[PDB]
Specification:
- It is classed as protein binding.
- The two termini are 24 Å apart.
- The chain has 124 residues and is α+β, with helices and mostly antiparallel strands.
- Strands 2-1-4-3 form a four-stranded mixed beta sheet, sandwiched between helices.
- It has a single domain, classed as Ubiquitin-like (UB roll), CATH 3.10.20.90.
- The protein is 31% helix and 19% strand.
- It contains four helices and four strands; from the N terminus they run H-H-E-E-H-E-H-E.
């Protein structure tokens, strides 16, 4: 019954900005890119295998699907084709990957309007 306190260095994009900052951010870009889906992608906390991604915020054309997106992040991470890789949403991978991101948004988006993803070598 012992709170494990995290290093304040370890904090996610969400943990670093305020709710109203986040809600505001979203409304701003959606006014400028109403055809795009704003996505936050970060390395899973406990993960040594895969590297840290240079950029973290992504505007995804609202037609693009999980299969394409996955492809895109692998390339951005410069993985070899034999590395295992998962993009996770609300902690779990995506079953339909021909489903376009705008559908996924509406079901999985966050209270603050962002869509949060996380990547790993294992599927949990």
């Amino acid at each position: 019954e012992w709170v494990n306190v995290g290093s304040p260095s370890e904090k996610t994009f969400k943990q670093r900005r305020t709710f109203e900052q986040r809600v505001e951010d979203v409304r701003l870009i959606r006014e400028q890119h109403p055809t795009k889906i704003p996505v936050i992608i970060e390395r899973y906390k406990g993960e040594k295998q895969l590297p840290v991604l240079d950029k973290t915020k992504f505007l995804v054309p609202d037609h693009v699907n999980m299969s394409e997106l996955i492809k895109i992040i692998r390339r951005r991470l410069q993985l070899n084709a034999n590395q295992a890789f998962f993009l996770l949403v609300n902690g779990h991978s995506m079953v339909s990957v021909s489903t376009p991101i705008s559908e996924v948004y509406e079901s999985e988006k966050d209270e603050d309007g962002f869509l949060y993803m996380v990547y790993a070598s294992q599927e949990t």
